[PDB]
């Protein structure tokens, strides 16, 4: 819709400006752009539409940008069910727990990995805390991440 | 305490000690110190006050000047917002760059007028000391 495309516009600027204002954005940021308009595509997802592994590789106008966002819209988003399901498969106890160490492993080691920094990051952000045994309720965590930075 | 000064000031300015400020009052004291304004300067300088200049219309125009500004804390933060490491200093080339061609670009004069005072020593421009200087 218009108020929508206007939103793409709004954000496109903040970005195209920061990597040198000139009406073009580094295809390596196309991810973060859309990540700002709510959506959270997967790296596999982004490259599919035009994203790049590195800066410099190439820049893009707003003309080519419209469809990348048309694209990253029709792509699957994870529900609470799904995040709860997957996390259960690591719980031997079955009581909604996990250890810090393991959670760390899941994030950094499995699936489209996550740098060790983004991890200590979101941990601190969501202010996730372990008990005496060093365990955490993965249910709470999933809920925050899902919540947003500003709830 | 901003007032206490204003008065004591109005006193030294109001030479003919008549509780009012006249074209001669201004011209008078200016010259006793540094170069003074020309008639035209003095004229429009008073026309800035509807009627006679009692210590009231005085504090009135002065207060309506310093109005429409923020905090020394609010500004010291808009600064530390570029002071990632929290060192309480900005690297001169950086700040100059920000103000110069970013956001609402400054101009060379705005640029010179601004740094003619700025407290930069060792490459780093202390925005604390400068936030004070620009404020209280």
């Amino acid at each position: 819709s218009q108020d929508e495309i206007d939103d793409l516009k709004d954000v496109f600027e903040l970005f195209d400006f920061w990597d040198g204002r000139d009406g073009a954005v580094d295809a390596f940021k196309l991810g973060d752009v859309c990540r700002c308009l709510g959506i959270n595509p997967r790296n596999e997802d982004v490259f599919a539409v035009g994203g790049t592994h590195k800066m410099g590789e190439k820049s893009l106008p707003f003309e080519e940008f419209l469809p990348a966002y048309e694209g990253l819209m029709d792509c699957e988003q994870g529900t609470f069910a799904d995040y709860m399901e997957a996390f259960k498969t690591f719980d031997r106890e079955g009581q909604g727990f996990i250890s810090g160490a393991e959670l760390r492993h899941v994030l950094t080691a499995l699936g489209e990995r996550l740098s060790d920094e983004d991890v200590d990051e979101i941990i601190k952000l969501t202010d996730l805390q372990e008990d005496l045994e060093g365990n955490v309720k993965y249910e709470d965590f999933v809920k925050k991440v899902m919540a947003g930075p500003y709830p | 305490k901003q007032i206490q000064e204003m008065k004591e000031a109005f006193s030294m300015i109001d030479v003919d000690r008549d509780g009012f400020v006249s074209k001669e009052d201004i011209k008078a004291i200016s010259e006793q110190l540094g170069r003074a304004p020309d008639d035209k300067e003095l004229t429009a300088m008073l026309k800035e006050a509807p009627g006679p200049l009692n210590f009231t219309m005085f504090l009135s125009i002065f207060s309506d000047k310093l109005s429409g500004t923020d905090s020394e804390e609010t500004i010291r933060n808009a600064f530390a917002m570029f002071d990632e490491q929290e060192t309480k200093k900005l690297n001169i080339e950086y700040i100059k760059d920000l103000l110069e061609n970013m956001g609402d670009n400054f101009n060379k004069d705005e640029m010179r007028m601004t740094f003619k005072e700025a407290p930069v020593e060792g490459g780093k421009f202390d925005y604390v000391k400068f936030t004070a200087m620009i404020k209280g």
Partner: protein, 772 residues
Amino acid sequence: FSDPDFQYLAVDQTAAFDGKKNCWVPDEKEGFASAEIQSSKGDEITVKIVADSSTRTVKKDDIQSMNPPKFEKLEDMANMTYLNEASVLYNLRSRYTSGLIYTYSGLFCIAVNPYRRLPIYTDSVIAKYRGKRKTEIPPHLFSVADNAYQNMVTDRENQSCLITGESGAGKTENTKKVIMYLAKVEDQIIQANPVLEAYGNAKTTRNNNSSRFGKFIRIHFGPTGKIAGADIETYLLEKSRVTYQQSAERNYHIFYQICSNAIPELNDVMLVTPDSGLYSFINQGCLTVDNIDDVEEFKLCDEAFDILGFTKEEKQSMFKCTASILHMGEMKFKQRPREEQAESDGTAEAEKVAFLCGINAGDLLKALLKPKVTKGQNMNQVVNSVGALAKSLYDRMFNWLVRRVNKTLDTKAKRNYYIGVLDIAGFEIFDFNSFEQLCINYTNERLQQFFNHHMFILEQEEYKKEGIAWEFIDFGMDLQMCIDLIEKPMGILSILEEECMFPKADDKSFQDKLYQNHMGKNRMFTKPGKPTRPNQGPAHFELHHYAGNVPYSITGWLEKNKDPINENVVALLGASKEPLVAEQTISAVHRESLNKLMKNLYSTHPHFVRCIIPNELKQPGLVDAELVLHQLQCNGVLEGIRICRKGFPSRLIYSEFKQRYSILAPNAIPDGKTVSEKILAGLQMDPAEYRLGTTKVFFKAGVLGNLEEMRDERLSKIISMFQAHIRGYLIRKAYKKLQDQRIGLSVIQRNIRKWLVLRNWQWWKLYSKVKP
């Protein structure tokens, strides 16, 4: 899924393929060759070899149906059109030369030895296999383990993995990875291997780290499905390696660790000179071992004794008793032309022995040269009772050692069910084979037949029980015989056992008493044939074992089965100073241990792992098709797959099925029997590849492996999607900051322009002036 963790785990296929021209034709080098028919002629087909492009004829009934490129490197072979010795060997070998060493053969797994380290066992990878259904994610040993866990849990019953294969295949490596896996989803457990392997492993021609004892380890689980204890059982340790070692072979690992100088401090505690080639008992065959650092292994072995919770005395008692042995064999002797009884030839080394065992060196050599009513021994009767002692001590050390490591594992915590793992030593044929081998081989037989029972005999039985419908199928796979030739009432062992009880007996009355009973009365027993390998030592008879024909030399089998240590020295040591030292025939005994093991197994829901030795050269990534093919034969792979496709060997209780395969159609799940009716319905699953059931689901062969595939895939995505969610959260969080800095700059820009214009205000100027 783009997951780096799948480099040597996920399969990386069209044209030139005529389903009527292309076929499999027998080969001598490759087992089977890719052929393209040229001309028929009754029975004489003339094909062209695609490889070299040569030509030849082949009986029509010797051509094998090739599979279409549709099934290249297939993860589950039960899903192939053709499951013949040439389709199977091709699929494996295809995968193998690409890093993939795991493949499902229907309901059980196939592991082909990599002979190189692979990044597929990491914690990164373990995370992804957790709770995944075999079809959901690539084939892996974790999947086999992970699944047995789910079954024990949901099905509430004991599980068990029989990891079989030839010697040097991967039985041990894989057994350890299973435990390491189950442990990760503890420290002492993992640590019990380093010590048991040091004392019960040795270089052999076949294996540089050959296990010389049978191992059955059960891993108990508590009410929250977590590890709550564990025990170990061992079987038939090669008492013989202690004092003897065929060329190109080493004695147990410890002995070499002990003489390396990993811990110089210990040299004086054991009284050893750091030279292995100095002690007869351990320098007969080999000394060093390409790729085994005795220095570091000693350290780690020492390190492991600590973690196991071994007091410093305890672990020094071990080290000393074993270094003591290194001396029993240094004790020289002499006769004394006359009677010969025998006299010593020094005493230096015979004391170090009495010393370490806390007994009088005098009282020792005494009860050793004239055992007490007295009865002196000659010059050899002694050197052989020396060995009888070395061997017998080491057999007690090893036994006590295990009892102790169980002390550290039998946590009195609460146990529900368990998952055992069976690693028994495999088939091995050498230049010379004797009693030791018959024992290992009889052991390995045995096991194979188990697979045959539970796989064919069994499957059909249950069909009857439940009272379904079916017609029998004879897979012709029975070894009861071979088994019988050796174990039954008048068998080989029973003959030997009744031959020991006679002091008169000898290597000839035993040899004759054997033919007397089975020559011509049992076809498995055949006079020794002709050499199929140089240096092929003596052979008295041959046995046709599942995986090979073995020529056995029965010389010395009578003493080997009846042990014999001076009941005298057993008295000396009975009251020794060292606290450790102070603390039925073999055949019958072992036969019994084994029967008991088997009995314990039958009460299980078995998952089978099949190891495969790629070649006779011990080098990695190289294949010997003949050998491979040959295994794909004596192991029953193909047949093992026919029934998975033919009948329907799977079976799942809707309760455990819903829990594991809901994540495959959750946008259709609002009763465990209907939920699955839905899931499998959603997936638009072919009514063929599965069946109803009152309490359980039946999936044709392979299908379940493929569901664990789809199961993983989804589990990986979802994990990515939550990582995407985390990526998008962190980005948007820092938006003000590009938002924040946009504001923080407007402050400064607008608020400096103010202080700038205020100084250009006459009033302020003049004001500032007055100031002082």
